Every structure is written in C-alpha cells, then in structure tokens.
Amino acid sequence: GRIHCRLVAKKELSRDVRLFRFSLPSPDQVLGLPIGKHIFVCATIEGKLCMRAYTPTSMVDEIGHFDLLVKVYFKNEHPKFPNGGLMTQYLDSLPVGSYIDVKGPLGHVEYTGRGSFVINGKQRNARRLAMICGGSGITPMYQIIQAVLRDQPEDHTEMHLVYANRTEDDILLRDELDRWAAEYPDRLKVWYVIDQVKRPEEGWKYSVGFVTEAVLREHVPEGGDDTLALASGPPPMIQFAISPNLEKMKYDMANSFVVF
C-alpha cells in the first residue's frame, strides 16, 4: 500500500554507502512491516517506476521513521555496464525533503512467535538457523536476527550467519553484529569471509575468499529434518556456492532454501 514518506535525511556511511532517513507521514505510527518482508520503493523513473524491493533495517519500536542503509551503484566504475544504475543513484541524487513512496509488506518469509517461521503457505518451526548472506543481503536477515535477540531471553535460538561479502572494507553492518554476537553467544554465530584482504596488517582471522564447502562445513549446522536456511545474494553466488555444496551438506534445498 502506498504512503507518502520523505527524505527526512541522508548519512552516507562511507565511500558509496548511504544511510537514508525516510520518515513516516504520521509520526505516531510505525512502518509496521512483518519480520520476513520488505518495501518496494517506488520512484517513477525514465519510463518505468523502478519498483525495487528493499528491507529497511532499524528498530520496529522506532516510531514515524524507517531506516535504509544503501550501497549506491555509481557510474564509470564497473565493466559489463560501467554505468551503475538508475534507481540507487537516483535515491542518492535525490535530496532531502523530497517525499518518497514506500509499500510494505510484500513477502513470503515471516517470523511468528519464539522460534517458528510461517512460510509461503505453510510455516516451519526452527531451533537453529543458517544465515549465509551475501553483499547488502544482510538487512533482510538482520530483520530476523535483531528481533530474535530482542524477544530474548526466551527465544534463545541459534544462528550461524556467514556474512558473505567481497572485501574487508565492505563489511557493511560489522559491529551491529560484531558487538552483538559476543555478548550473545549460544544465540548467534557470526562469520566473515572476504576475497580481497586490504589490510593484512589489521590482522585477518576470518575467511579469505568466497563460499566453499570448507567454509560451509565449520560455520553452518546440519540440516536433515529441522533446520532452515535464510540466504541472500547475487544469483551466481547461489547457483554454484550455496545451493550445490549445501545440496551436498545433507540439507533440504527445495523444501526450505529461502532467499530475499
């Protein structure tokens, strides 16, 4: 359903990493979007209305505003299409004060009470989870995580996330995890993997490269019957290294391999 939010404010978290403050129309209510869903930000562009799915990441309690951290897809910086992209750039260029158009809640995943999941029709109850994200696919997962640890200490579920990302500096929500899953052990299991390691001198101890069975062995639990997987990332980073090795890792692919 539409809404008339607005660019209340902008905080470009780094190089090409935005932090958008689109407030609500009526600041007394929430962008009440069920944990398992996302908005379809409508910004009429070119001859289309570039409806791009997005899950803000901030707190559900937060009244009258919803936060979106973006990874802007700039120009003259990338082969195959040097250009970047109409919409994200457009969301950058877009100056504050300008009213946007939101659209919750268009999804399939959704977290019921403590532990269980409702899902595309059915619903499946899971104790320990598998969170092999990828890129800025952290947020739609964060949507589950934070909630799971807020509903604590009674939810007390297990999450073995695998923040798949491309480089050391490109670990978006580092701390919001790397602060969290320290004070909360048994609860969440963080893991960070990276192709390029900019500063060996910082001292890297997490994975170096991309998702492979060995990474998917220690950092991920057994599937069998009872464990769900909540993946998120570039399709190839799914066809060859999330679906195959996990297809072999005695887990269920059809019945529960979820993406968003």
Ligand X SMILES: Cc1cc2nc3c(=O)[nH]c(=O)nc-3n(C[C@H](O)[C@H](O)[C@H](O)COP(=O)(O)OP(=O)(O)OC[C@H]3O[C@@H](n4cnc5c(N)ncnc54)[C@H](O)[C@@H]3O)c2cc1C
Please say which residue, 58 or 116, places its beta carbon nearer to ligand X: 58
53, 63, 118, 147: residue in contact with ligand X (rule CB under 6 A): 53
d(CA 129, CA 159): 5
Distance of alpha carbon 28 from alpha carbon 185, whole angstroms: 35
Mask 11-50, x = binds ligand X (CB under 6 A)?
Answer: ---------------------------x-----------x
192 is in an annotated binding site: no
- Which residue number, 68 or 187, has a Cβ lying nearer to ligand X? 68
> Is residue 53 part of an annotated ligand binding site?
yes
Kindly report the backbone phi and psi dihedral angles of residue 143, in degrees, each rounded to the nearest multiple of 5, phi listed first. Answer: -55, -30
Alpha-carbon distances, residue 64 vs 54, 112, 138, 142 (angstroms) = 18, 23, 23, 20
Place of tokens 């491309």: 166
Q: Is 69 annotated as a binding residue?
A: yes
Identify the CA nearest to 158 among candidates 181, 180, 189.
189
In angstroms, give the least distance from the CB of 31 to ligand X.
Answer: 14
| DSSP per-residue string spanning 217-258 | HTTS---TTT--EE--S-THHHHTTTSSHHHHTT--STTTEE
- Would you count residue 74 as binding ligand X (CB under 6 A)? yes
Cα distance between residue 97 and residue 32, in whole Å: 22
Of the residues 5, 33, 35, 88, which one makes contact with ligand X according to CB under 6 A? 88
Annotated binding-site residue? 86: yes
Residue placing its CB nearer to ligand X in the complex, 173 or 193: 173
Which residues in 54-73 contact ligand X (CB under 6 A)? 54-55, 69-71, 73
- DSSP one-letter code for 85: -
Binding of residue 78 to ligand X (CB under 6 A): yes
Q: How many helices (H) and strands (E) does the chain have?
A: 7, 13
CB of 130 to ligand X, least distance (A): 19
Residues flagged as binding site for FAD: 52-55, 69-71, 74, 86-88, 136, 139
- Residues near ligand X (CB under 6 A) are 38, 50, 52-55, 69-71, 73-74, 77-78, 81, 84-88, 136, 139-140, 260
